[PDB]
UniProtKB/Swiss-Prot annotation:
Belongs to the splicing factor SR family. The chain holds residues 258 to 336 of 475 of the full protein. The lineage of its organism: Eukaryota, Metazoa, Chordata, Craniata, Vertebrata. It is found in: Nucleus. Plays a role in pre-mRNA splicing and 3'-end processing. By recruiting PRPF19 and the PRP19C/Prp19 complex/NTC/Nineteen complex to the RNA polymerase II C-terminal domain (CTD), and thereby pre-mRNA, may couple transcription to splicing. Induces cardiac troponin-T (TNNT2) pre-mRNA exon inclusion in muscle. Regulates the TNNT2 exon 5 inclusion through competition with MBNL1. Binds preferentially to a single-stranded structure within the polypyrimidine tract of TNNT2 intron 4 during spliceosome assembly. It comes from Homo sapiens (Human). Residues 3-80 form the RRM domain. The modification 5-hydroxylysine is found at residue 20. This is Splicing factor U2AF 65 kDa subunit. It is linked to Developmental delay, dysmorphic facies, and brain anomalies: An autosomal dominant disorder characterized by global developmental delay with intellectual disability and speech delay, epilepsy, hypotonia, short stature, microcephaly, intermittent exotropia, and non-specific facial dysmorphism. Brain imaging shows a thin corpus callosum and/or delayed myelination. It comes from the Eukaryota. The modification Phosphoserine is found at residue 38.
């Protein structure tokens, strides 16, 4: 859907609350998950989210795509 994003490249030590805080700085979320290895529990650095508002979605992909977080760079797209 047009409100949904697929994010990769997050530093693997960031937790759900920290990733969620970065995302909600753009506007409110209606869904979120941070992808984890089922056996180790460690983050894979991917996240999926859905914003309430389409305009926020558009600004979030523009703002997050290419964002540098230390030695990592986010790659973000709409979740077609």
């Amino acid at each position: 859907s047009a409100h949904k994003l697929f994010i990769g490249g997050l530093p693997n030590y960031l937790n759900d609350d920290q990733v969620k805080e970065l995302l909600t700085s753009f506007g409110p979320l209606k869904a979120f998950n941070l992808v984890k290895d089922s056996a180790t529990g460690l983050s894979k650095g991917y996240a999926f989210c859905e914003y309430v508002d389409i305009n926020v979605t558009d600004q979030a992909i523009a703002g997050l795509n290419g964002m540098q977080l230390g030695d990592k760079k986010l790659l973000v797209q709409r979740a077609s």
